[PDB]
Amino acid sequence: STDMWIERTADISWESDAEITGSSERVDVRLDDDGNFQLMYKKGDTTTGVYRIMTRGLLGSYQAGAGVMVEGVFHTLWATTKGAALMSGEGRLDPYWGSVKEDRLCYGGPWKLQHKWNGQDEVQMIVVEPGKNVKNVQTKPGVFKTPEGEIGAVTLDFPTGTSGSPIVDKNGDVIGLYGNGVIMPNGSYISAIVQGERMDEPI
Amino acid sequence: STDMWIERTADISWESDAEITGSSERVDVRLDDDGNFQLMYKKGDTTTGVYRIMTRGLLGSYQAGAGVMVEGVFHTLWATTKGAALMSGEGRLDPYWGSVKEDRLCYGGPWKLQHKWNGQDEVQMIVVEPGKNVKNVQTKPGVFKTPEGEIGAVTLDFPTGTSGSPIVDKNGDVIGLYGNGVIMPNGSYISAIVQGERMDEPI
């Protein structure tokens, strides 16, 4: 009886067609037993992939954000759930680590995301825009002037319900998440590639 | 030294050109003293109009929502500021009344918005999309099935930073605000016309 739940909506993969034309709708198929198509107290389902973050409202459901499931751990921005538990399949997901300053949050275990943009190559964002089929969008990040140092950031503009969508390199490795955009002197919006170093479970 | 501020970005008016083509960018001009153009402990500026709601973040500013200023009172959704004070010009605006259930909130005085959609005519939304010039968009609302009764709602889809943008009738009267969209059985999103009855200041 939690207030939020996650739904798997895509695989983690760099798309050649998105490298071909700039944007490509994902064809993550799923069949029944006859061949018919369908495109996308317990511990919850941690199947690796890209997830929508849904929550119930006054008059219906809506997508509060997005996240990525890696190594049995769900990663998202802090601002998408602010720590609320997540229903995943038959079970539930409780927050494990988070940082309001870094705008990062992970469920089921510590932060597992390790790779980061190399600063030269182009990247593909697995866009999970609300009410929109999942698509990979190719774009070139950039190093921008921040008081927080010099972080990678992308020029794409998507609704805040897309925040937390994973960004991947040519290997399909998640180099960061899509954060909430900030405004530029010209009036446009820039979203940073939200990423931190991998932390570990001692034992 | 508040954390949020509002910026006036449009007048409250029904646009004939939006009634002509469906959508029309607003031409709310403003001149200097030479004729050059520019398009859009104290009590803050309550100049009647349409406002962007901006807030500072880690790496810059962003639009948290929108609102409308009527009769010296700023109206917006509760979810845009959640009660945070607002800098308006030389002064500040403190929340006066609000309702989390109704998703309504007003600063500087009680709720002044009285008119509501008549259920038959078309309406124009003064869209204050983040990073976008303000435009009026014509659309026909509809009465939809809700457990909360039967409320008016529009089929337009805009980022949550647009939430709180005023919706007006042919007279330019604000018949409600643009709420956060909820999902439909088909997967699309529907935004209700957030409106309540006018409350008064006794004396």
mmCIF file with all atom_site columns, N, CA, C and O in Angstrom, chain A residues 133-179:
data_model
loop_
_atom_site.group_PDB
_atom_site.id
_atom_site.type_symbol
_atom_site.label_atom_id
_atom_site.label_alt_id
_atom_site.label_comp_id
_atom_site.label_asym_id
_atom_site.label_entity_id
_atom_site.label_seq_id
_atom_site.pdbx_PDB_ins_code
_atom_site.Cartn_x
_atom_site.Cartn_y
_atom_site.Cartn_z
_atom_site.occupancy
_atom_site.B_iso_or_equiv
_atom_site.pdbx_formal_charge
_atom_site.auth_seq_id
_atom_site.auth_comp_id
_atom_site.auth_asym_id
_atom_site.auth_atom_id
_atom_site.pdbx_PDB_model_num
ATOM 1   N N  . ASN A 1 133 ? 6.086  7.216  -26.069 1.00 0.00 ? 133 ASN A N  1
ATOM 2   C CA . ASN A 1 133 ? 6.871  6.006  -26.258 1.00 0.00 ? 133 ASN A CA 1
ATOM 3   C C  . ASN A 1 133 ? 8.346  6.302  -26.021 1.00 0.00 ? 133 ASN A C  1
ATOM 4   O O  . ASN A 1 133 ? 8.841  7.383  -26.352 1.00 0.00 ? 133 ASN A O  1
ATOM 5   N N  . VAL A 1 134 ? 9.046  5.333  -25.436 1.00 0.00 ? 134 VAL A N  1
ATOM 6   C CA . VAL A 1 134 ? 10.452 5.519  -25.109 1.00 0.00 ? 134 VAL A CA 1
ATOM 7   C C  . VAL A 1 134 ? 11.269 5.576  -26.391 1.00 0.00 ? 134 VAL A C  1
ATOM 8   O O  . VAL A 1 134 ? 11.082 4.760  -27.303 1.00 0.00 ? 134 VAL A O  1
ATOM 9   N N  . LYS A 1 135 ? 12.177 6.547  -26.469 1.00 0.00 ? 135 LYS A N  1
ATOM 10  C CA . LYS A 1 135 ? 13.041 6.708  -27.627 1.00 0.00 ? 135 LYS A CA 1
ATOM 11  C C  . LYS A 1 135 ? 14.447 7.054  -27.163 1.00 0.00 ? 135 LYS A C  1
ATOM 12  O O  . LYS A 1 135 ? 14.639 7.670  -26.111 1.00 0.00 ? 135 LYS A O  1
ATOM 13  N N  . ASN A 1 136 ? 15.431 6.639  -27.957 1.00 0.00 ? 136 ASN A N  1
ATOM 14  C CA . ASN A 1 136 ? 16.814 7.039  -27.748 1.00 0.00 ? 136 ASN A CA 1
ATOM 15  C C  . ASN A 1 136 ? 17.091 8.287  -28.574 1.00 0.00 ? 136 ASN A C  1
ATOM 16  O O  . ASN A 1 136 ? 16.712 8.354  -29.748 1.00 0.00 ? 136 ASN A O  1
ATOM 17  N N  . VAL A 1 137 ? 17.731 9.279  -27.960 1.00 0.00 ? 137 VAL A N  1
ATOM 18  C CA . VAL A 1 137 ? 18.027 10.546 -28.616 1.00 0.00 ? 137 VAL A CA 1
ATOM 19  C C  . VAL A 1 137 ? 19.524 10.803 -28.506 1.00 0.00 ? 137 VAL A C  1
ATOM 20  O O  . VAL A 1 137 ? 20.063 10.893 -27.397 1.00 0.00 ? 137 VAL A O  1
ATOM 21  N N  . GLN A 1 138 ? 20.188 10.920 -29.653 1.00 0.00 ? 138 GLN A N  1
ATOM 22  C CA . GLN A 1 138 ? 21.613 11.214 -29.685 1.00 0.00 ? 138 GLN A CA 1
ATOM 23  C C  . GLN A 1 138 ? 21.851 12.701 -29.461 1.00 0.00 ? 138 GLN A C  1
ATOM 24  O O  . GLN A 1 138 ? 21.110 13.547 -29.969 1.00 0.00 ? 138 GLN A O  1
ATOM 25  N N  . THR A 1 139 ? 22.892 13.017 -28.695 1.00 0.00 ? 139 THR A N  1
ATOM 26  C CA . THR A 1 139 ? 23.237 14.408 -28.439 1.00 0.00 ? 139 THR A CA 1
ATOM 27  C C  . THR A 1 139 ? 24.673 14.481 -27.941 1.00 0.00 ? 139 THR A C  1
ATOM 28  O O  . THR A 1 139 ? 25.220 13.506 -27.418 1.00 0.00 ? 139 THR A O  1
ATOM 29  N N  . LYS A 1 140 ? 25.278 15.654 -28.123 1.00 0.00 ? 140 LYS A N  1
ATOM 30  C CA . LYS A 1 140 ? 26.635 15.905 -27.661 1.00 0.00 ? 140 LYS A CA 1
ATOM 31  C C  . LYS A 1 140 ? 26.590 16.713 -26.376 1.00 0.00 ? 140 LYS A C  1
ATOM 32  O O  . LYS A 1 140 ? 26.152 17.875 -26.404 1.00 0.00 ? 140 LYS A O  1
ATOM 33  N N  . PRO A 1 141 ? 27.016 16.163 -25.240 1.00 0.00 ? 141 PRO A N  1
ATOM 34  C CA . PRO A 1 141 ? 27.073 16.964 -24.014 1.00 0.00 ? 141 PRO A CA 1
ATOM 35  C C  . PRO A 1 141 ? 28.129 18.054 -24.082 1.00 0.00 ? 141 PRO A C  1
ATOM 36  O O  . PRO A 1 141 ? 28.868 18.167 -25.066 1.00 0.00 ? 141 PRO A O  1
ATOM 37  N N  . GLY A 1 142 ? 28.209 18.855 -23.031 1.00 0.00 ? 142 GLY A N  1
ATOM 38  C CA . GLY A 1 142 ? 29.193 19.919 -22.963 1.00 0.00 ? 142 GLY A CA 1
ATOM 39  C C  . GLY A 1 142 ? 29.540 20.232 -21.527 1.00 0.00 ? 142 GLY A C  1
ATOM 40  O O  . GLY A 1 142 ? 28.727 20.043 -20.616 1.00 0.00 ? 142 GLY A O  1
ATOM 41  N N  . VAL A 1 143 ? 30.765 20.705 -21.324 1.00 0.00 ? 143 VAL A N  1
ATOM 42  C CA . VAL A 1 143 ? 31.224 21.148 -20.015 1.00 0.00 ? 143 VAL A CA 1
ATOM 43  C C  . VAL A 1 143 ? 30.838 22.613 -19.857 1.00 0.00 ? 143 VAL A C  1
ATOM 44  O O  . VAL A 1 143 ? 31.235 23.459 -20.664 1.00 0.00 ? 143 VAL A O  1
ATOM 45  N N  . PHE A 1 144 ? 30.055 22.913 -18.824 1.00 0.00 ? 144 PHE A N  1
ATOM 46  C CA . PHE A 1 144 ? 29.510 24.246 -18.629 1.00 0.00 ? 144 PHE A CA 1
ATOM 47  C C  . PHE A 1 144 ? 29.975 24.837 -17.304 1.00 0.00 ? 144 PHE A C  1
ATOM 48  O O  . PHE A 1 144 ? 30.362 24.122 -16.375 1.00 0.00 ? 144 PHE A O  1
ATOM 49  N N  . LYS A 1 145 ? 29.926 26.167 -17.237 1.00 0.00 ? 145 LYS A N  1
ATOM 50  C CA . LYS A 1 145 ? 30.409 26.919 -16.085 1.00 0.00 ? 145 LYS A CA 1
ATOM 51  C C  . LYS A 1 145 ? 29.429 26.777 -14.927 1.00 0.00 ? 145 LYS A C  1
ATOM 52  O O  . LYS A 1 145 ? 28.290 27.247 -15.007 1.00 0.00 ? 145 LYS A O  1
ATOM 53  N N  . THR A 1 146 ? 29.865 26.132 -13.850 1.00 0.00 ? 146 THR A N  1
ATOM 54  C CA . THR A 1 146 ? 29.058 26.000 -12.648 1.00 0.00 ? 146 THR A CA 1
ATOM 55  C C  . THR A 1 146 ? 29.878 26.383 -11.427 1.00 0.00 ? 146 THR A C  1
ATOM 56  O O  . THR A 1 146 ? 31.090 26.153 -11.389 1.00 0.00 ? 146 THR A O  1
ATOM 57  N N  . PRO A 1 147 ? 29.244 26.983 -10.417 1.00 0.00 ? 147 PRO A N  1
ATOM 58  C CA . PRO A 1 147 ? 29.921 27.122 -9.118  1.00 0.00 ? 147 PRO A CA 1
ATOM 59  C C  . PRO A 1 147 ? 30.220 25.783 -8.476  1.00 0.00 ? 147 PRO A C  1
ATOM 60  O O  . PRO A 1 147 ? 31.114 25.701 -7.625  1.00 0.00 ? 147 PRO A O  1
ATOM 61  N N  . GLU A 1 148 ? 29.498 24.731 -8.862  1.00 0.00 ? 148 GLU A N  1
ATOM 62  C CA . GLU A 1 148 ? 29.715 23.378 -8.370  1.00 0.00 ? 148 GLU A CA 1
ATOM 63  C C  . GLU A 1 148 ? 30.844 22.661 -9.100  1.00 0.00 ? 148 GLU A C  1
ATOM 64  O O  . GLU A 1 148 ? 30.902 21.426 -9.063  1.00 0.00 ? 148 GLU A O  1
ATOM 65  N N  . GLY A 1 149 ? 31.730 23.397 -9.765  1.00 0.00 ? 149 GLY A N  1
ATOM 66  C CA . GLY A 1 149 ? 32.769 22.789 -10.571 1.00 0.00 ? 149 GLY A CA 1
ATOM 67  C C  . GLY A 1 149 ? 32.455 22.866 -12.050 1.00 0.00 ? 149 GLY A C  1
ATOM 68  O O  . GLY A 1 149 ? 31.885 23.857 -12.516 1.00 0.00 ? 149 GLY A O  1
ATOM 69  N N  . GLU A 1 150 ? 32.817 21.831 -12.804 1.00 0.00 ? 150 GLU A N  1
ATOM 70  C CA . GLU A 1 150 ? 32.523 21.760 -14.235 1.00 0.00 ? 150 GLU A CA 1
ATOM 71  C C  . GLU A 1 150 ? 31.961 20.375 -14.544 1.00 0.00 ? 150 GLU A C  1
ATOM 72  O O  . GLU A 1 150 ? 32.703 19.392 -14.624 1.00 0.00 ? 150 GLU A O  1
ATOM 73  N N  . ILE A 1 151 ? 30.644 20.315 -14.716 1.00 0.00 ? 151 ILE A N  1
ATOM 74  C CA . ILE A 1 151 ? 29.920 19.065 -14.889 1.00 0.00 ? 151 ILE A CA 1
ATOM 75  C C  . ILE A 1 151 ? 29.475 18.944 -16.342 1.00 0.00 ? 151 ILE A C  1
ATOM 76  O O  . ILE A 1 151 ? 29.360 19.932 -17.075 1.00 0.00 ? 151 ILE A O  1
ATOM 77  N N  . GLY A 1 152 ? 29.238 17.704 -16.763 1.00 0.00 ? 152 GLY A N  1
ATOM 78  C CA . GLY A 1 152 ? 28.650 17.477 -18.067 1.00 0.00 ? 152 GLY A CA 1
ATOM 79  C C  . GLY A 1 152 ? 27.175 17.825 -18.079 1.00 0.00 ? 152 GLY A C  1
ATOM 80  O O  . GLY A 1 152 ? 26.477 17.726 -17.069 1.00 0.00 ? 152 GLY A O  1
ATOM 81  N N  . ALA A 1 153 ? 26.692 18.238 -19.248 1.00 0.00 ? 153 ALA A N  1
ATOM 82  C CA . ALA A 1 153 ? 25.310 18.677 -19.367 1.00 0.00 ? 153 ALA A CA 1
ATOM 83  C C  . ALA A 1 153 ? 24.873 18.579 -20.819 1.00 0.00 ? 153 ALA A C  1
ATOM 84  O O  . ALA A 1 153 ? 25.687 18.714 -21.737 1.00 0.00 ? 153 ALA A O  1
ATOM 85  N N  . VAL A 1 154 ? 23.575 18.349 -21.014 1.00 0.00 ? 154 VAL A N  1
ATOM 86  C CA . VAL A 1 154 ? 22.991 18.188 -22.338 1.00 0.00 ? 154 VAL A CA 1
ATOM 87  C C  . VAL A 1 154 ? 21.994 19.313 -22.582 1.00 0.00 ? 154 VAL A C  1
ATOM 88  O O  . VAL A 1 154 ? 21.403 19.863 -21.647 1.00 0.00 ? 154 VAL A O  1
ATOM 89  N N  . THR A 1 155 ? 21.807 19.653 -23.856 1.00 0.00 ? 155 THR A N  1
ATOM 90  C CA . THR A 1 155 ? 20.955 20.767 -24.255 1.00 0.00 ? 155 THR A CA 1
ATOM 91  C C  . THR A 1 155 ? 19.512 20.355 -24.521 1.00 0.00 ? 155 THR A C  1
ATOM 92  O O  . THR A 1 155 ? 18.689 21.219 -24.843 1.00 0.00 ? 155 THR A O  1
ATOM 93  N N  . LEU A 1 156 ? 19.186 19.072 -24.396 1.00 0.00 ? 156 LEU A N  1
ATOM 94  C CA . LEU A 1 156 ? 17.828 18.614 -24.652 1.00 0.00 ? 156 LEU A CA 1
ATOM 95  C C  . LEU A 1 156 ? 16.874 19.117 -23.575 1.00 0.00 ? 156 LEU A C  1
ATOM 96  O O  . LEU A 1 156 ? 17.245 19.282 -22.410 1.00 0.00 ? 156 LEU A O  1
ATOM 97  N N  . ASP A 1 157 ? 15.630 19.361 -23.977 1.00 0.00 ? 157 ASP A N  1
ATOM 98  C CA . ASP A 1 157 ? 14.595 19.880 -23.092 1.00 0.00 ? 157 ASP A CA 1
ATOM 99  C C  . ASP A 1 157 ? 13.404 18.932 -23.113 1.00 0.00 ? 157 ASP A C  1
ATOM 100 O O  . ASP A 1 157 ? 12.774 18.742 -24.160 1.00 0.00 ? 157 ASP A O  1
ATOM 101 N N  . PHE A 1 158 ? 13.095 18.349 -21.960 1.00 0.00 ? 158 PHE A N  1
ATOM 102 C CA . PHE A 1 158 ? 11.993 17.415 -21.803 1.00 0.00 ? 158 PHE A CA 1
ATOM 103 C C  . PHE A 1 158 ? 11.273 17.721 -20.499 1.00 0.00 ? 158 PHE A C  1
ATOM 104 O O  . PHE A 1 158 ? 11.869 18.303 -19.585 1.00 0.00 ? 158 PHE A O  1
ATOM 105 N N  . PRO A 1 159 ? 9.993  17.358 -20.390 1.00 0.00 ? 159 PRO A N  1
ATOM 106 C CA . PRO A 1 159 ? 9.255  17.630 -19.150 1.00 0.00 ? 159 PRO A CA 1
ATOM 107 C C  . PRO A 1 159 ? 9.921  16.985 -17.945 1.00 0.00 ? 159 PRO A C  1
ATOM 108 O O  . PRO A 1 159 ? 10.639 15.990 -18.060 1.00 0.00 ? 159 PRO A O  1
ATOM 109 N N  . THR A 1 160 ? 9.671  17.573 -16.772 1.00 0.00 ? 160 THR A N  1
ATOM 110 C CA . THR A 1 160 ? 10.288 17.085 -15.543 1.00 0.00 ? 160 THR A CA 1
ATOM 111 C C  . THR A 1 160 ? 9.933  15.634 -15.254 1.00 0.00 ? 160 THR A C  1
ATOM 112 O O  . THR A 1 160 ? 10.666 14.964 -14.518 1.00 0.00 ? 160 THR A O  1
ATOM 113 N N  . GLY A 1 161 ? 8.831  15.132 -15.813 1.00 0.00 ? 161 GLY A N  1
ATOM 114 C CA . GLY A 1 161 ? 8.521  13.720 -15.687 1.00 0.00 ? 161 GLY A CA 1
ATOM 115 C C  . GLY A 1 161 ? 9.526  12.819 -16.373 1.00 0.00 ? 161 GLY A C  1
ATOM 116 O O  . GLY A 1 161 ? 9.554  11.615 -16.106 1.00 0.00 ? 161 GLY A O  1
ATOM 117 N N  . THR A 1 162 ? 10.348 13.376 -17.263 1.00 0.00 ? 162 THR A N  1
ATOM 118 C CA . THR A 1 162 ? 11.438 12.634 -17.879 1.00 0.00 ? 162 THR A CA 1
ATOM 119 C C  . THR A 1 162 ? 12.686 12.601 -17.009 1.00 0.00 ? 162 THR A C  1
ATOM 120 O O  . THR A 1 162 ? 13.575 11.779 -17.262 1.00 0.00 ? 162 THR A O  1
ATOM 121 N N  . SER A 1 163 ? 12.766 13.462 -15.995 1.00 0.00 ? 163 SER A N  1
ATOM 122 C CA . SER A 1 163 ? 13.958 13.541 -15.161 1.00 0.00 ? 163 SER A CA 1
ATOM 123 C C  . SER A 1 163 ? 14.261 12.190 -14.527 1.00 0.00 ? 163 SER A C  1
ATOM 124 O O  . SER A 1 163 ? 13.365 11.496 -14.040 1.00 0.00 ? 163 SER A O  1
ATOM 125 N N  . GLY A 1 164 ? 15.539 11.818 -14.544 1.00 0.00 ? 164 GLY A N  1
ATOM 126 C CA . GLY A 1 164 ? 15.973 10.513 -14.099 1.00 0.00 ? 164 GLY A CA 1
ATOM 127 C C  . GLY A 1 164 ? 16.173 9.508  -15.212 1.00 0.00 ? 164 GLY A C  1
ATOM 128 O O  . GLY A 1 164 ? 16.681 8.411  -14.949 1.00 0.00 ? 164 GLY A O  1
ATOM 129 N N  . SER A 1 165 ? 15.782 9.846  -16.438 1.00 0.00 ? 165 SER A N  1
ATOM 130 C CA . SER A 1 165 ? 15.997 8.953  -17.568 1.00 0.00 ? 165 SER A CA 1
ATOM 131 C C  . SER A 1 165 ? 17.492 8.720  -17.763 1.00 0.00 ? 165 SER A C  1
ATOM 132 O O  . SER A 1 165 ? 18.275 9.681  -17.725 1.00 0.00 ? 165 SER A O  1
ATOM 133 N N  . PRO A 1 166 ? 17.928 7.481  -17.970 1.00 0.00 ? 166 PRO A N  1
ATOM 134 C CA . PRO A 1 166 ? 19.365 7.213  -18.045 1.00 0.00 ? 166 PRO A CA 1
ATOM 135 C C  . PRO A 1 166 ? 19.976 7.720  -19.342 1.00 0.00 ? 166 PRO A C  1
ATOM 136 O O  . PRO A 1 166 ? 19.333 7.761  -20.393 1.00 0.00 ? 166 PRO A O  1
ATOM 137 N N  . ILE A 1 167 ? 21.240 8.116  -19.243 1.00 0.00 ? 167 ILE A N  1
ATOM 138 C CA . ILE A 1 167 ? 22.051 8.510  -20.387 1.00 0.00 ? 167 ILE A CA 1
ATOM 139 C C  . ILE A 1 167 ? 23.163 7.482  -20.536 1.00 0.00 ? 167 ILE A C  1
ATOM 140 O O  . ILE A 1 167 ? 23.830 7.139  -19.553 1.00 0.00 ? 167 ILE A O  1
ATOM 141 N N  . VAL A 1 168 ? 23.359 6.987  -21.759 1.00 0.00 ? 168 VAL A N  1
ATOM 142 C CA . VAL A 1 168 ? 24.285 5.893  -22.007 1.00 0.00 ? 168 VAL A CA 1
ATOM 143 C C  . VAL A 1 168 ? 25.304 6.302  -23.062 1.00 0.00 ? 168 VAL A C  1
ATOM 144 O O  . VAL A 1 168 ? 25.073 7.199  -23.875 1.00 0.00 ? 168 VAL A O  1
ATOM 145 N N  . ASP A 1 169 ? 26.446 5.620  -23.035 1.00 0.00 ? 169 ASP A N  1
ATOM 146 C CA . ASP A 1 169 ? 27.492 5.778  -24.029 1.00 0.00 ? 169 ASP A CA 1
ATOM 147 C C  . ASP A 1 169 ? 27.331 4.711  -25.113 1.00 0.00 ? 169 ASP A C  1
ATOM 148 O O  . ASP A 1 169 ? 26.351 3.961  -25.137 1.00 0.00 ? 169 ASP A O  1
ATOM 149 N N  . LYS A 1 170 ? 28.310 4.636  -26.020 1.00 0.00 ? 170 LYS A N  1
ATOM 150 C CA . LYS A 1 170 ? 28.236 3.686  -27.125 1.00 0.00 ? 170 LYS A CA 1
ATOM 151 C C  . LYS A 1 170 ? 28.216 2.239  -26.654 1.00 0.00 ? 170 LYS A C  1
ATOM 152 O O  . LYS A 1 170 ? 27.746 1.367  -27.392 1.00 0.00 ? 170 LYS A O  1
ATOM 153 N N  . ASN A 1 171 ? 28.722 1.961  -25.454 1.00 0.00 ? 171 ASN A N  1
ATOM 154 C CA . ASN A 1 171 ? 28.716 0.609  -24.912 1.00 0.00 ? 171 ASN A CA 1
ATOM 155 C C  . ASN A 1 171 ? 27.411 0.252  -24.225 1.00 0.00 ? 171 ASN A C  1
ATOM 156 O O  . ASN A 1 171 ? 27.281 -0.868 -23.720 1.00 0.00 ? 171 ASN A O  1
ATOM 157 N N  . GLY A 1 172 ? 26.446 1.163  -24.191 1.00 0.00 ? 172 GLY A N  1
ATOM 158 C CA . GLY A 1 172 ? 25.247 0.945  -23.417 1.00 0.00 ? 172 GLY A CA 1
ATOM 159 C C  . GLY A 1 172 ? 25.420 1.100  -21.926 1.00 0.00 ? 172 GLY A C  1
ATOM 160 O O  . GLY A 1 172 ? 24.502 0.749  -21.175 1.00 0.00 ? 172 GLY A O  1
ATOM 161 N N  . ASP A 1 173 ? 26.567 1.606  -21.470 1.00 0.00 ? 173 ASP A N  1
ATOM 162 C CA . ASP A 1 173 ? 26.784 1.844  -20.050 1.00 0.00 ? 173 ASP A CA 1
ATOM 163 C C  . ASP A 1 173 ? 26.158 3.164  -19.639 1.00 0.00 ? 173 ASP A C  1
ATOM 164 O O  . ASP A 1 173 ? 26.267 4.165  -20.350 1.00 0.00 ? 173 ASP A O  1
ATOM 165 N N  . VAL A 1 174 ? 25.520 3.172  -18.475 1.00 0.00 ? 174 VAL A N  1
ATOM 166 C CA . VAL A 1 174 ? 24.833 4.367  -18.003 1.00 0.00 ? 174 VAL A CA 1
ATOM 167 C C  . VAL A 1 174 ? 25.879 5.317  -17.428 1.00 0.00 ? 174 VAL A C  1
ATOM 168 O O  . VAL A 1 174 ? 26.470 5.047  -16.380 1.00 0.00 ? 174 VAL A O  1
ATOM 169 N N  . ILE A 1 175 ? 26.113 6.435  -18.125 1.00 0.00 ? 175 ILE A N  1
ATOM 170 C CA . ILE A 1 175 ? 27.081 7.428  -17.676 1.00 0.00 ? 175 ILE A CA 1
ATOM 171 C C  . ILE A 1 175 ? 26.449 8.511  -16.816 1.00 0.00 ? 175 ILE A C  1
ATOM 172 O O  . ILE A 1 175 ? 27.148 9.446  -16.400 1.00 0.00 ? 175 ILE A O  1
ATOM 173 N N  . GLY A 1 176 ? 25.158 8.423  -16.542 1.00 0.00 ? 176 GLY A N  1
ATOM 174 C CA . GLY A 1 176 ? 24.505 9.404  -15.703 1.00 0.00 ? 176 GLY A CA 1
ATOM 175 C C  . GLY A 1 176 ? 23.019 9.457  -15.979 1.00 0.00 ? 176 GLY A C  1
ATOM 176 O O  . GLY A 1 176 ? 22.501 8.793  -16.878 1.00 0.00 ? 176 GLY A O  1
ATOM 177 N N  . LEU A 1 177 ? 22.342 10.273 -15.179 1.00 0.00 ? 177 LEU A N  1
ATOM 178 C CA . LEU A 1 177 ? 20.905 10.464 -15.273 1.00 0.00 ? 177 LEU A CA 1
ATOM 179 C C  . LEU A 1 177 ? 20.587 11.854 -15.809 1.00 0.00 ? 177 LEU A C  1
ATOM 180 O O  . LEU A 1 177 ? 21.413 12.770 -15.769 1.00 0.00 ? 177 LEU A O  1
ATOM 181 N N  . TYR A 1 178 ? 19.365 11.996 -16.315 1.00 0.00 ? 178 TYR A N  1
ATOM 182 C CA . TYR A 1 178 ? 18.880 13.259 -16.858 1.00 0.00 ? 178 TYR A CA 1
ATOM 183 C C  . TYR A 1 178 ? 18.270 14.069 -15.720 1.00 0.00 ? 178 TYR A C  1
ATOM 184 O O  . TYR A 1 178 ? 17.205 13.720 -15.201 1.00 0.00 ? 178 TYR A O  1
ATOM 185 N N  . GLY A 1 179 ? 18.950 15.147 -15.326 1.00 0.00 ? 179 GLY A N  1
ATOM 186 C CA . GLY A 1 179 ? 18.469 15.978 -14.243 1.00 0.00 ? 179 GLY A CA 1
ATOM 187 C C  . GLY A 1 179 ? 17.504 17.053 -14.712 1.00 0.00 ? 179 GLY A C  1
ATOM 188 O O  . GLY A 1 179 ? 17.295 17.264 -15.905 1.00 0.00 ? 179 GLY A O  1
#
